Design a binder for this molecule. Structure first.
Ligand SMILES: N[C@@H](CCCC[NH3+])C(=O)O
Length: 400
């Protein structure tokens, strides 16, 4: 009633599926298309699938089953994504670690998650003497097999990945959460099979999912950035032109540091900070579709998306399809439109909660007295203060 704002109604984005289903569909439908480009090395979707499958079978032999958590720590490049996909194909969920993660934090996170192990490279294996958990190398997980190993299937209720944010706090995202997010957001972004997608985010960040898994969803080609390029905005601008990139997921401060426009960019998805007006004016051109995505990690990558246009005020926009937002008071009561309260998010992509933290989970994932379907019974309290304006639009106002 103007005080509960919903994204478009799209029940077809909820399927009886897991991430392995989405990727396998793409690889079997487009075997010979290039999936991954690292420098001058390229891997096809079919190649990627068979290699990741061999790795997943090795994980199975070593005891990885659906519902397990496997840590991921490798340098940016093909092997890193390959290993992510191998964990996924084994039916386990992955716990991603940035290149710059200290070994002690790795140990704290693997312990907190009760992970059965982690994947890393021969080189980095020695940095992990402090890690008591099992460490596998991608290399050993890539050796030939004598007889095939049958992979147990995971289910939508099972975790797809665990994101840590610091006492470390692990956020459990389910297969259902992430598969729905991918379909819901791509229905608006519309990444296409012909697209060439820059892959610059560390796997430890939400926007890596928009770079990688949206592409996997439609069979786009990923160009994987080296560590040295990620901190060189002018060189990156020239790289994006020379590599004929069409899709940039990035943060506003990075876009602002580009000297020239990059004409070949179909889609520009800015997340993290609300895009400033000067940047919109500089970039919200006709040959660019410039977007602003907002959302906590606790509701799978993004919860709202906004089309940016020169001269139009910037807001977080409307919820994604099947997402919903409302505002509540200090005692969890729905507020009339226009008042200021805590922004709450609901829908099929609300995370399962905080790993091993029933306390904080119950504090922040509460029952929704106002759910109009079984996919709306869980409200996540963002902690942000917000108001719903006279146009059904949510306005952020800072923390509570
Ligand atoms: N979700 C990220 C920033 C927003 C990304 C939106 N595509 C975070 O919570 O740190």
């Amino acid at each position: 009633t103007k005080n509960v704002i919903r994204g478009k109604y799209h029940p077809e984005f909820l399927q009886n599926e897991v991430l392995a289903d989405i990727f396998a569909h793409t690889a079997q439908t487009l075997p010979d298309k290039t999936a991954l480009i690292e420098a001058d090395k390229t891997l096809s979707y079919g190649e990627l699938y068979q290699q990741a499958l061999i790795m997943a079978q090795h994980l199975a032999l070593k005891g990885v089953k659906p519902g397990h958590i496997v840590g991921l720590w490798l340098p940016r490049g093909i092997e890193l994504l390959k290993a992510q996909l191998a964990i996924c194909l084994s039916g386990a969920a992955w716990l991603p670690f940035d290149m710059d993660t200290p070994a002690d934090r790795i140990a704290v996170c693997l312990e907190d998650a009760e992970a059965v192990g982690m994947i890393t490279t021969d080189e980095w294996y020695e940095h992990l003497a402090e890690v008591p958990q099992t460490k596998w190398t991608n290399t050993e997980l890539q050796k030939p097999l004598s007889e095939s190993v049958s992979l147990a299937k995971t289910t939508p209720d099972q975790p797809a990945y665990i994101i840590y944010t610091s006492k470390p706090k692990g956020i459990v995202i389910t297969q259902k959460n992430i598969c729905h997010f991918l379909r819901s957001e791509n229905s608006i972004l519309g990444i296409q099979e012909q697209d060439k997608v820059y892959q610059g985010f560390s796997v430890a960040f939400d926007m890596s999912f928009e770079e990688i898994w949206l592409s996997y969803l439609v069979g786009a080609t990923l160009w994987i950035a080296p560590k040295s390029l990620v901190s060189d905005p002018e060189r990156l601008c020239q790289t994006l032109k020379q590599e004929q990139i069409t899709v940039l997921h990035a943060v506003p401060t990075l876009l602002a540091l580009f000297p020239e426009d990059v004409p070949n960019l179909r889609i520009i998805n800015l997340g993290g900070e609300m895009c400033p007006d000067s940047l919109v004016d500089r970039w919200a051109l006709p040959h660019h579709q410039m977007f602003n995505t907002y959302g906590p990690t606790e509701t799978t990558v993004s919860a709202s998306l906004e089309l940016l246009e020169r001269g139009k005020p910037v807001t977080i926009g409307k919820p994604l399809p099947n997402y919903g937002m409302l505002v509540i008071n200090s005692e969890r009561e729905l507020l009339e439109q226009g008042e200021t309260g805590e922004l709450c998010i609901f829908g099929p992509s609300v995370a399962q909660g905080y790993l091993g933290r029933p306390d904080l989970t119950a504090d922040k994932f509460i029952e929704n007295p106002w759910a109009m379907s079984v996919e709306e019974e869980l409200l996540y309290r963002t902690g942000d203060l917000a108001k719903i304006d006279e146009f059904g639009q949510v306005h952020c106002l800072g923390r509570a």
